[PDB]
């Protein structure tokens, strides 16, 4: 309404030219941007000096992981079991066909890319390796009993290496209650709680499109009924930190567990 009808269009078009020019410059910058970076490795990975360990079944009440249920009442653990089942639906032999049977038992380093359309080789991790926590024989994963199976998993970081001495092994325990009760006791699968070192390192979602993190399964045999307990699973390994106070999931998982009867 203000300026002239004949030039409203003229600098309307000027702004158009301004945005298209600038837009263009952005376009070219992001083209160069993507041409700069390696497709198989991260340039810097700065927040990943140590990996975070996640856990299944992940149920957060508030303030973090809070897993409560009542063994006599299928409906409080059915969905827990189900999130285990559909999590391991990609750890089945049928699904996990495109990977090799790792027996290296030490860091598996691939310098040359040998696999269809220039990918590289991943190890196997099939469900049955978690054994008593695989979904067979028990499809409740030890919940119905009162010794539930939690599936601990380490986050993947390209070319990261966790140690030489032994395999990186997980360790779950109470947050000490030493006078008023025994200490926690767990059976892990595969045994000793170890992710075999042939599962490291990761070479990237392009180098290994069909890759899968190693698991361990903690089966809690000790835990008392109708009492809140807090449980921590740390990863014991040299090249891993488990007490970064600004990230409570770096190397460790905590959760509150209550098993009611």
């Amino acid at each position: 309404l203000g300026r002239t009808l004949s030039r409203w269009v003229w600098i309307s078009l000027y702004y158009v030219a301004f945005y298209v020019v600038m837009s263009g410059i952005f376009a070219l910058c992001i083209y160069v941007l993507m041409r700069t970076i390696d497709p198989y490795t991260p340039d810097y990975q700065d927040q990943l000096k140590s990996p975070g360990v996640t856990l299944r079944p992940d149920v957060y009440g508030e303030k973090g992981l809070d897993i409560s249920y009542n063994v006599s009442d299928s409906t409080t653990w059915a969905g827990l079991a189900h999130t285990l089942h559909r999590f391991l639906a990609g750890y089945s032999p049928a699904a996990q066909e495109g990977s090799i049977n790792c027996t290296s038992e030490k860091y598996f380093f691939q310098e040359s890319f040998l696999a269809p359309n220039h990918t590289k080789f991943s190890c196997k991790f099939t469900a049955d390796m978690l054994q008593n926590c695989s979904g067979r024989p028990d499809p409740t994963f030890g919940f119905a009993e009162g010794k539930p199976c939690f599936i601990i998993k380490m986050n993947r970081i390209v070319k990261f290496l966790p140690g030489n001495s032994t395999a990186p092994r997980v360790d779950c325990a109470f947050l000490d209650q030493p006078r008023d009760g025994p200490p926690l006791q767990v059976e892990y699968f595969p045994a000793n709680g170890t992710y075999s070192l042939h599962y490291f390192p990761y070479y990237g979602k392009k180098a290994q499109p069909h890759y899968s993190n190693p698991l361990v399964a903690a089966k809690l045999l000790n835990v008392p009924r109708n009492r809140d307990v807090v449980i921590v699973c740390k990863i014991l390994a040299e090249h891993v930190s488990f007490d970064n106070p600004h990230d409570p999931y770096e190397g460790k998982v905590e959760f509150k567990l209550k098993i009611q009867k």
């Binding site: 030039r7 941007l33 198989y40 991260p42 990975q45 927040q47 990996p51 970081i157 600004h246 770096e250």
Partner: protein, 987 residues
């Protein structure tokens, strides 16, 4: 009220009314009661200044209203979020705490500043109690002026301040200085008989504020305190309410721009937000976050410290401003209505002219003696100098050897004081000199003898005769001279010389000056031998056949620096009007002496007098000048005043009541002028208040005027007004440089949120960090632009046009927000993706990732290389997007502070290092910028992390595209000053 009949009453009715005695006065008891009844004889000051309402008023204003609304909107949004369990609402809190904080802190500043102004002004006041000589129970004694009550018999002599409104009951040669009530420069006779019905123009009333120049009088207090004429004038000026200042009006108009844009950006992006599947609740919380982001948390700080720096400049030239806004007003001013007496003039009867040796000489009348003196070589001079130095009983108060001679207090009549200062300035040590010539006879000024005479013995012993010296009205002196000193001799006083005398006499009276003749006679030593017994009453010495010496003549003259100031103001396009209560002859004379009315410009009465035509037939357009007097100003319809005001551009209002000065100021404001008035007396206090800025004389000025005024000339130096103009045009031009520099960075703060809404990419920019930008890093850069010199010749420009010419307008807003802001945005996002990609998140993954990004329940999200990141880790990465968008912003602001240095000139033309303070500010900018990043622990204090030095470099191309794009802009501005390109890309 009371006085309109008090002067008219008979003495019987007067002592009847007031229950008093015209000869003995009030009883001691009664007067004491009356004092209880009526309160002190003193003007009431403003009753309440609770120190806390000073502060509470500091917290209002266009920006501050905006900041307050924006704080509320912050908190209402915090409610709406917390109720539906949205985390990191703490950003809302910070924003409001900051906002409130900024306005409070500015507030304290603005309050303490005002404090520090009002004390310095108060440092100058004289707080010793004025006194009165009262007669009570027939006893004459001294009381404080404020213990006077209505009905007191008081007494006045030369030197006294009239202590109340007194009805004059008797007077011997009482002459009084009404320059403060009326504008009247000339002494005013007081006498007991009713001269008028209006007490303002009657002669039998002396006025509570004024000074008794000479003579003696006695009379009855007819009014006290605020019931005096002075108190009613200061009432009238209290009820005057002053308009909003120009700078405030400008700030409000651009707060209206910012409001408009924030409202509509909120609207359109809220509509948009619904059409992408957001809860009504959160499209409204975005609406809120957006209008808040258009509010610059820091601009109030930068504007006030800018203004405050100009207040420092003006203070250091003895110009003290009460509130910071006023610092600017003289820049935008386009009319100056000025007082004459004591404002333009000195209000100090000064010797101006002399007639001796058949010639009219002219003395230096300036107060610092920076003018050009007259010819002091001749014998005739030193004779005249002797008559005027010896025939005078005035005298300097003691302990004054250091205070300049025009500024010295003296005990003597008006004329005699003038002449004493004249002799002291010309001959030096007058009192000593005339002591060396023992006075042995004396006739004081006498209404039956009509002259003043005194006979003296001489200096060296070898000369034994006497010299009779005389001074009086010129015609009366001449009728007793038979002789005249000329050019080394003493000539018969023939008809040639009398015609010459009368032409010089009327020539000098025509300038409206007070001229007196001076004569002398050396008496014989035969007929008047050493020790001769001179008897006045039987006049046994001669008083005719005297030897005429010369004329000396006097006037109230302009202040030294005034005429150049008036001319500098006019060549800055400032119409300058004279509003004075004095009489029109004087009004015009001074108007010419100073430059109100130019050489060769004539009033319609001058055209008629030149062509010898009835004034009716003269073409009024042919008269540059006009002198309208105050009792035809009534008869003028407001449109007769607008016509007259814009037909003759050199206007002189004479004999104008305080109200009429308010009328003129108001009539000019209605025609859109920003008018300023300059003044001293109380008759200016109303006008001074109404004006867009009132400028009072520090020393000359009455208390009511100093109170009405926004600005005080502590040394009474009128030329500070022309520096006021200059500084005022500077900050204006410099404020829009600083404003613009702070507004642009607002768009590369809002857009990353806008995108983050619509595209749902992880948060590019957090609120903590845009607080650090706005309230910390970019502040010094923004106020440093206040140190920019002019680019054109500021002082030959016309006044800014308040309608078209504005602080920020559509060009500056558009260009700064949506072009340089855009470039800054693109620089931000470019650095965003770069940091992300380098740390692992590809741009296409970034589209719609926000839900998963912020999801505290995903502690294993996969990046483009399929790496699983905890929540904290993605969070640190987000802080890295903060720091990266922040340092992008900064670098483009290093481009922006330098580009805003100039609005038409090139930086290669004038400089990168011109402004040493701005270079300092940038060094400070990257210093704290680096401290925010690399200090140990910063991630967990504020959200900044040490960005890799790659990411510093990534924006610098966009910065320099800003430099070069704006340099070509302000290269075509000056290269091709045509139509198309300047309207659009000049601000």
């Amino acid at each position: 009220e009371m006085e309109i009949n008090d002067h008219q009453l008979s003495v019987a009715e007067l002592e009847q009314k007031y229950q008093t005695s015209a000869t003995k006065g009030l009883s001691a008891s009664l007067a004491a009661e009356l004092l209880l009844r009526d309160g002190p004889n003193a003007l009431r000051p403003p009753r309440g200044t609770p120190e806390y309402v000073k502060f509470a008023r500091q917290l209002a204003g266009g920006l501050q209203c905006l900041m307050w609304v924006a704080a509320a909107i912050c908190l209402i949004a915090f409610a709406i979020q917390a109720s539906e369990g949205d985390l990191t609402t703490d950003d809302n809190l910070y924003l409001a705490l900051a906002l409130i904080a900024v306005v409070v802190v500015t507030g304290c500043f603005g309050y303490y500043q005002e404090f520090k102004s009002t004390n310095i002004i108060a440092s100058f006041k004289n707080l010793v109690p004025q006194q009165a000589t009262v007669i009570r129970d027939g006893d004459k004694f001294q009381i404080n002026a404020d213990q006077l009550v209505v009905g007191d018999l008081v007494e006045m002599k030369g030197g006294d301040r009239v202590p109340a409104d007194i009805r004059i009951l008797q007077a011997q040669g009482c002459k009084v200085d009404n320059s403060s009530l009326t504008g009247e420069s000339e002494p005013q006779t007081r006498s007991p008989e009713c001269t008028h019905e209006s007490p303002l123009e009657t002669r039998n009333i002396a006025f509570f504020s004024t000074m008794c120049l000479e003579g003696t009088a006695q009379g009855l207090v007819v009014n006290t305190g605020d019931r005096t004429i002075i108190g009613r004038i200061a009432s009238l000026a209290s009820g005057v309410e002053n308009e909003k200042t120009p700078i405030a009006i400008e700030i409000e108009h651009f707060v209206d721009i910012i409001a408009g844009l924030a409202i509509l950006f909120g609207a359109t992006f809220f509509i948009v937000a619904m059409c992408i599947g957001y809860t009504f609740l959160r499209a409204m919380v975005f609406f809120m976050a957006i209008v808040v982001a258009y509010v610059p948390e820091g601009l109030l700080a930068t504007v006030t410290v800018c203004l405050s720096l100009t207040a420092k400049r003006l203070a250091s030239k003895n110009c003290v401003v009460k509130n910071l806004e006023a610092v600017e007003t003289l820049g935008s001013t386009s009319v100056i209505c000025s007082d004459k007496t004591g404002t333009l003039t000195q209000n100090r009867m000064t010797v101006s002219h002399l007639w001796f040796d058949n010639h009219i000489h002219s003395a230096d009348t300036t107060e610092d003696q920076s003018g050009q003196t007259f010819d002091q070589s001749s014998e005739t001079w030193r004779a005249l100098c002797r008559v005027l130095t010896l025939c005078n009983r005035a005298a300097f108060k003691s302990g004054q050897d250091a205070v300049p001679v025009p500024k010295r207090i003296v005990i003597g009549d008006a004329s005699e004081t003038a002449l004493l200062k004249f002799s002291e300035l010309t001959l030096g040590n007058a009192m000593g000199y005339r002591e060396r010539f023992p006075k042995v006879c004396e006739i004081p000024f006498n209404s039956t003898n009509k002259f003043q005479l005194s006979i003296h013995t001489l200096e060296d012993p070898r000369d034994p005769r006497h010299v009779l010296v005389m001074k009086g009205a010129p015609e009366r002196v001449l009728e007793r001279c038979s002789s005249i000193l000329i050019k080394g001799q003493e000539l018969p006083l023939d008809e040639q010389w009398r015609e010459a005398f009368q032409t010089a006499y009327l020539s000098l009276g025509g300038l409206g000056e007070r001229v007196l003749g001076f004569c002398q006679l050396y008496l014989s030593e035969k007929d008047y031998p050493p020790g001769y017994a001179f008897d006045v009453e039987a006049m046994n010495f001669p008083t005719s056949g005297l030897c005429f010496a010369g004329l000396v003549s006097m006037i109230d003259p302009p202040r030294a620096t005034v005429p150049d100031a008036v001319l500098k103001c006019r060549t800055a396009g400032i119409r300058v009007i004279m509003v004075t209560g004095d009489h029109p002859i004087t009004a015009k004379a001074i108007a010419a002496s100073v430059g109100i009315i130019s050489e060769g410009s004539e009033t319609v009465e001058d055209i008629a007098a030149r062509l010898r035509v009835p004034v009716d037939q003269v073409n009024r357009k042919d008269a540059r000048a006009c002198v309208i007097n105050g009792m035809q100003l009534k008869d003028m319809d407001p449109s007769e005043l607008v016509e007259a005001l814009r037909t003759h551009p050199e206007m002189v209002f004479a004999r104008t009541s305080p109200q009429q000065k308010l009328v003129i100021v108001e009539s000019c404001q209605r025609l859109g002028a920003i008018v300023a008035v300059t003044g001293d007396g109380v008759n200016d206090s109303p006008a001074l208040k109404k004006a867009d800025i009132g400028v009072a004389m520090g020393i000359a000025g009455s208390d009511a005027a100093k109170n009405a005024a926004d600005m005080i000339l502590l040394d009474d130096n009128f030329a500070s007004i022309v520096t006021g103009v200059e500084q005022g045009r500077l900050i204006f031009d410099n404020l829009k440089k600083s404003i613009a520099y702070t507004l642009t960075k607002n768009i590369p703060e809002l857009t990353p949120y806008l995108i983050y809404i619509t595209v749902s990419v992880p948060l590019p920019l957090g609120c903590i960090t845009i607080l650090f930008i706005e309230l910390c890093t970019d502040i010094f850069p923004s106020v440093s632009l206040a140190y920019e010199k002019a680019e054109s010749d500021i002082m030959h420009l016309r006044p800014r046009n308040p309608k078209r010419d504005r602080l920020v307008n559509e060009p500056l807003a558009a260009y700064s927000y949506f072009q340089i802001g855009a470039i800054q945005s693109f620089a931000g996002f470019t650095d965003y993706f770069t940091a992300m990609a380098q740390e692992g998140w590809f741009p296409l993954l970034c589209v719609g990732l926000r839900p998963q990004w912020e999801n505290h329940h995903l502690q294993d999200l996969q990046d483009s290389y399929g790496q699983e990141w905890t929540f904290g880790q993605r969070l640190y990465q987000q802080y890295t997007c903060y720091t990266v968008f922040f340092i992008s912003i900064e670098m483009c602001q290093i481009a922006d502070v330098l580009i805003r240095k100039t609005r038409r000139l090139s930086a290669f033309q004038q400089g990168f290092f011109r402004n040493r303070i701005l270079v300092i500010a940038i060094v400070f900018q990257v210093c704290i910028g680096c401290f925010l990043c690399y200090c140990p622990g910063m991630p967990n204090i504020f959200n900044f992390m040490p960005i890799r030095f790659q990411w510093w470099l990534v924006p610098m191309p966009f910065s320099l595209l800003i430099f070069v794009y704006d340099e070509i802009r302000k290269l075509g501005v000056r290269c091709c000053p045509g139509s198309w390109w300047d309207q659009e890309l000049y601000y």
